[PDB]
């Protein structure tokens, strides 16, 4: 229902006929999320507050206390800078051994309300 627009993908490429690729629809929102979460709240001095501040929660003890702060860190950032999306919960899990923290954000563009989970395809 919400308009999604169009813009170039994160890994930009020549395309079928040359020039520059261009992608819209449900795929585009995923690319914007990939940019927003990956970058630290820096490296972009003109826009400092942009970029999810996740590095402050590295090397914490494995507790739901730090697993809860990250749960709220994503919410503010995923909402402030990406308004064309509605966020449906995050899931912090130690899916391999017990020394890593995986986040599984589930989102759904407004009105379309089809649930999807961001995957970070490498």
């Amino acid at each position: 229902e919400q308009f999604v627009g169009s813009g170039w993908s994160f890994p930009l490429r020549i395309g079928p006929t040359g020039g520059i690729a261009l992608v819209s629809g449900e795929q585009e929102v995923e690319e914007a999320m990939r940019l927003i979460l990956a970058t630290a709240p820096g490296e972009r001095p003109m826009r400092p507050e942009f970029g999810c501040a996740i590095h402050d929660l590295v090397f914490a003890p494995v507790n739901e206390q730090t697993a809860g702060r990250i749960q709220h860190e994503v919410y503010v950032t995923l909402d402030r800078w990406e308004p064309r999306i509605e966020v449906h919960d995050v899931d912090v899990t130690t899916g391999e051994e017990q020394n890593v923290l995986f986040i599984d954000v589930r989102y759904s563009i407004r009105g379309t309300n089809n649930p999807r989970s961001l995957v970070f395809p490498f």
């Binding site: 020549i14 395309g15 079928p16 006929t17 040359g18 795929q27």
Partner: protein
């Protein structure tokens, strides 16, 4: 500008309750609903004020404006094969090659324009040759081994190597083996800039190189060449085969030749592939469109690219008791009788018109073109898409051939698409009308006469038109003075020969200005 307004909103139509007729004193949920379900007038009125986009297309025909038809792109599709065994028609005309299919909608798909045939071409005669040494009826220079001298161990312009080609099929690829006994200093294959040839019936023709073992044969090489048209070698001997020529060009400063070229020992020719140009096209079958309302003027749209021009490529099948009724496409409706079955199609878009009704005076409802009965199913049997800009495919992108009808594989083009042009939209043509409708085209006054020449010859530095004065023949004709461009040397002096214009330049001006001249006026050109 000053457009009348034709809107009277929906509610005002229910306003006429008019309870002043006997006894109909009732409210909303009565079965007086026909007072409201005739709100279609609101839908009708809104349709009046809107002037349809299709209307612009009508009066571009009225004022003599031709819409822009879309084109397509032509490429150089090259086949490949690994089992050269015989000759037959391995490529039916219209064989379809396709690009890779990924998340970018649907891959663009081409279609060959001709029929391609493979031939396992063998050799003819290997002959010794050097500059100034013709064949002189020599054939067996390598028929029984003993090697053959390569340019007398001295390659200079005019040299060539002589080998026959059994068939010389115009659109195939030849694989020549060059087993050379290595002698002297080894060299990079690219270093000697040798040029191939074929001795076409029109004369010598060039060829390209796609393998390292072509020149500078430090090791026995395997030349691969795509045949540039059909040819036959200069028959003096015992082999009427095709022709090859390892002509060596001038010695470049950075690309020099070398003495003591290696001596050829064994050689053999094979066919590996064939190259044929193709146009961006496709053939879709069984595209149902829905059901007909049985009313005149129905319009149907195809959810694909513009239909490519050619033989009638939009076959409309209509359900009937006897089966399928086929509609033949026609040009502009004109005199189409009610009995006849006819349709109108748009080249640049999927809009497909149908029989338009018209209520003439006395209400004859003179209908042009038949109308399908209500409930009939309409489907498109044949449909040839392909036109548009989205055929400007990048170099070497097409990699899969459709339906894999023969035993062929690895179909990869070498050169990028020529590039088609997308047809103009109605909105784009709405901007063309104010300009191209008033582009002079009369040549009345002096300004036009000098201006029109400039349009015909944009490269002219100075043009001016002076009328022939009185006491001069030619029926008050005019003279045109033309000054061709020229750089007057670094020395500051200009030769007189540079001032005269070329004959073609003068002819080009005259040919164009002859058509747009007014009645009974003569023009002559030339320097003052």
């Amino acid at each position: 500008r000053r457009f009348q307004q034709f809107v009277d909103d929906a509610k005002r139509y229910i306003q006429q309750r008019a309870p002043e007729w006997t006894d109909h004193n009732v409210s909303d949920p009565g079965v007086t609903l026909v007072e409201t379900v005739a709100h279609m007038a609101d839908q009708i009125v809104y349709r009046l004020n809107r002037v349809p986009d299709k209307n612009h297309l009508a009066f571009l025909d009225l004022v003599g404006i031709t819409l822009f038809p879309p084109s397509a792109a032509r490429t150089d599709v090259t086949f490949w094969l690994s089992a050269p065994q015989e000759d037959a028609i391995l490529v039916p005309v219209g064989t379809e090659v396709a690009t890779l299919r990924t998340e970018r909608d649907e891959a663009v798909v081409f279609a060959t324009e001709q029929d391609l045939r493979i031939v396992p071409c063998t050799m003819g005669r290997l002959v010794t040759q050097v500059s100034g040494e013709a064949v002189s009826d020599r054939t067996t220079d390598l028929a029984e081994s003993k090697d053959v001298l390569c340019f007398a161990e001295a390659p200079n312009p005019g040299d060539c190597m002589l080998i026959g080609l059994s068939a010389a099929v115009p659109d195939c690829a030849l694989a020549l083996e060059l087993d050379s006994r290595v002698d002297g200093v080894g060299v990079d294959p690219r270093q000697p800039p040798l040029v191939w040839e074929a001795w076409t019936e029109d004369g010598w023709q060039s060829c390209e190189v796609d393998r390292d073992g072509t020149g500078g044969l430090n090791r026995p090489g395997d030349v691969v060449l795509h045949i540039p048209g059909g040819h036959v070698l200069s028959r003096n001997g015992g082999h009427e085969a095709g022709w090859i020529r390892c002509r060596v060009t001038e010695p470049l400063s950075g690309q020099p030749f070398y003495t003591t070229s290696p001596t050829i020992r064994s050689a053999e020719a094979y066919t590996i592939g064939g190259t044929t140009g193709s146009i961006h096209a496709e053939t879709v079958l069984d595209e149902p469109l829905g059901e007909s309302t049985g009313l005149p003027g129905q319009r149907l749209r195809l959810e694909h690219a513009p239909v490519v021009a050619g033989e009638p490529s939009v076959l409309l099948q209509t359900a009937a008791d006897d089966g399928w009724q086929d509609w033949q496409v026609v040009p502009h409706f004109s005199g189409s009788h009610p009995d006849d079955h006819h349709i109108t199609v748009d080249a640049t878009t999927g809009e497909i018109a149908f029989g338009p009704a018209v209520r003439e005076a006395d209400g004859t409802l003179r209908q042009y073109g038949a109308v399908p009965p209500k409930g009939a199913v309409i489907r498109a049997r044949r449909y040839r898409t392909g036109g548009g800009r989205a055929g400007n495919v990048a170099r070497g992108a097409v990699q899969v051939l459709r339906t894999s009808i023969p035993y062929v594989s690895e179909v990869v083009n070498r050169e990028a698409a020529l590039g088609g042009v997308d047809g103009e939209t109605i909105e784009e043509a709405k901007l063309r009308a104010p300009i191209t409708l008033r582009a002079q085209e009369r040549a009345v006054t002096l300004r036009d006469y000098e201006e029109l020449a400039r349009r015909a010859a944009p490269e002219t530095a100075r043009i001016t038109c002076l009328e022939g004065a009185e006491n001069e023949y030619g029926a008050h004709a005019v003279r045109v003075l033309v000054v061709p461009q020229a750089v007057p040397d670094p020395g500051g002096r200009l030769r007189f020969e540079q001032l005269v214009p070329g004959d073609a330049l003068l002819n080009r001006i005259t040919r164009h200005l002859d058509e747009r001249r007014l009645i009974g006026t003569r023009l002559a050109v030339g320097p003052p």
